[PDB]
Amino acid sequence: AILSST
Amino acid sequence: AILSST
Amino acid sequence: AILSST
Amino acid sequence: AILSST
Questions:
Q1: Is C6 within 8 Å of B1 when comparing Cβ atoms?
Q2: Maximum Cα–Cα distance for chain C, whole Å?
Q3: What letter would DSSP give residue A5?
Q4: How are strands ordered across the β-sheet holding A2-5?
Q5: Do C2 and D2 touch (CB under 8 A)?
Q6: Those residues with Cβ within 8 angstroms of residue B4's Cβ, 6 or more apart along the chain or in another chain
Q7: What are residue A3's phi and psi, to 5 degrees?
Q8: DSSP secondary structure string, A1-6?
Q9: DSSP 3-state assignment of B1?
Q10: Residue B1 and residue A5: Cβ atoms within 8 Å?
Q11: In D, what residues contact C, Cβ < 8 A?
């Protein structure tokens, strides 16, 4: 899985 | 912004 | 699944 | 904006 918080 | 890929 | 919150 | 693909 990929999680990106920006 | 949040991006989730599962 | 793909979830994009912007 | 929210985009969900499942």
A1: yes
A2: 17
A3: E
A4: A2-5, B2-5, C2-5, D2-5
A5: no
A6: A1, A2, A3, A4, C1, C2, C3, C4
A7: -125, 120
A8: -EEEE-
A9: coil
A10: yes
A11: 1-6
